[PDB]
Amino acid sequence: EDPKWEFPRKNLVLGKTLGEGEFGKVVKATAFHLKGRAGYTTVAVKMLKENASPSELRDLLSEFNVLKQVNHPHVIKLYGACSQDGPLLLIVEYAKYGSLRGFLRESRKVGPGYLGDERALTMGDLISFAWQISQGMQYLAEMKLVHRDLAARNILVAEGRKMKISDFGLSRDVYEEDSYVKRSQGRIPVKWMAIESLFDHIYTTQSDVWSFGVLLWEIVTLGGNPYPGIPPERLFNLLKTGHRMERPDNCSEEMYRLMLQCWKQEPDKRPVFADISKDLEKMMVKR
Numbered sequence: 337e338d339p340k341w342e343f344p345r346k347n348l349v350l351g352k353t354l355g356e357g358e359f360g361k362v363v364k365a366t367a368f369h370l371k372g373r374a375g376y377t378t379v380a381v382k383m384l385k386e387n388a389s390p391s392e393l394r395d396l397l398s399e400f401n402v403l404k405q406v407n408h409p410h411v412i413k414l415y416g417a418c419s420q421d422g423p424l425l426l427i428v429e430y431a432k433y434g435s436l437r438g439f440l441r442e443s444r445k446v447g448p449g450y451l452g453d454e455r456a457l458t459m460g461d462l463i464s465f466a467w468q469i470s471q472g473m474q475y476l477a478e479m480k481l482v483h484r485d486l487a488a489r490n491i492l493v494a495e496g497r498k499m500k501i502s503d504f505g506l507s508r509d510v511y512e513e514d515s516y517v518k519r520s521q522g523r524i525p526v527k528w529m530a531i532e533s534l535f536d537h538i539y540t541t542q543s544d545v546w547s548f549g550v551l552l553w554e555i556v557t558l559g560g561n562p563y564p565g566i567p568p569e570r571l572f573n574l575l576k577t578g579h580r581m582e583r584p585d586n587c588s589e590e591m592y593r594l595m596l597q598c599w600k601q602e603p604d605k606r607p608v609f610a611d612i613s614k615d616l617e618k619m620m621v622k623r
């Protein structure tokens with residue numbers, strides 16, 4: 337019911353489903369006189385499914401709450417909400433290329449594809465994508481937020497192939513003690529979770545770093561599936577015994593070193609996002 341965000345329901349027109357997010361459906365839409373931009377502006381709208389649970393409603397409200405506060409070139413934007421005359425709707429930035437996972441998988445088969453024109457991809461483009469994400473995460477970490485669900489499916493690729501971190505439904509503030517801890521089992525897919533989150537239910541910026549490492553692996557494999565062929569229940573023993581994903585095919589030694597650093601068992605031995613950004617900057621420049 338926030339005046340600064342509430343948008344007239346009659347000014348919003350919903351269209352096709354773009355996909356489904358962790359708490360609901362995302363549809364393409366158009367908004368008339370959005371934040372005083374004349375005419376219609378193409379947007380996306382996040383809504384709840386009819387059979388929504390209280391968790392899913394709470395996740396929608398928590399994404400709204402987080403995105404009201406944050407503003408960065410590599411974080412997807414919140415524009416407004418419709419809460420009054422029917423179903424709860426979040427009005428968010430449209431990202432024309434869809435998810436990073438989708439975009440990279442398409443590059444295997446489409447356009448000039450991966451080489452080593454938005455459809456032409458080089459290893460420089462891939463380092464750039466990772467750098468943009470790291471910059472967003474560095475800012476979110478400064479804002480004492482922990483995303484918790486960092487993954488290629490939760491990064492969007494917008495006009496100009498600009499990275500936008502999205503899907504904040506599981507994100508949490510860590511104001512005090514710099515950790516988020518939950519007694520109950522989490523809803524993040526096991527394959528992206530830091531070892532201490534999996535065993536101890538502890539989430540910090542350093543566990544986002546772990547997930548960032550899994551995202552780096554997804555990036556260099558052009559949307560590969562982590563721990564391929566390994567059932568999720570096996571990760572408990574696999575990680576505990578010090579195993580990690582192997583170096584992928586078109587991954588440099590330096591890129592793999594960075595991944596391994598992100599997956600250090602000891603969270604304070606992992607790089608912070610500021611340093612990851614620095615590592616990626618020197619990779620882009622040593623070309």
Ligand SMILES: COC(=O)c1ccc2c(c1)NC(=O)/C2=C(\Nc1ccc(N(C)C(=O)CN2CCN(C)CC2)cc1)c1ccccc1
Binds near residue numbers: 353354380382412504
């Ligand atoms: C806080 O804000 C958010 O959290 C948030 C979350 C998602 C999106 C968003 C904001 N803003 C967008 O634009 C989003 C998506 N946009 C999109 C755009 C283009 C496509 N593309 C390329 C299609 O081709 C569409 N196509 C997909 C396949 N099906 C079968 C038919 C429709 C697909 C998604 C998208 C939504 C669902 C999941 C993945 C991404």
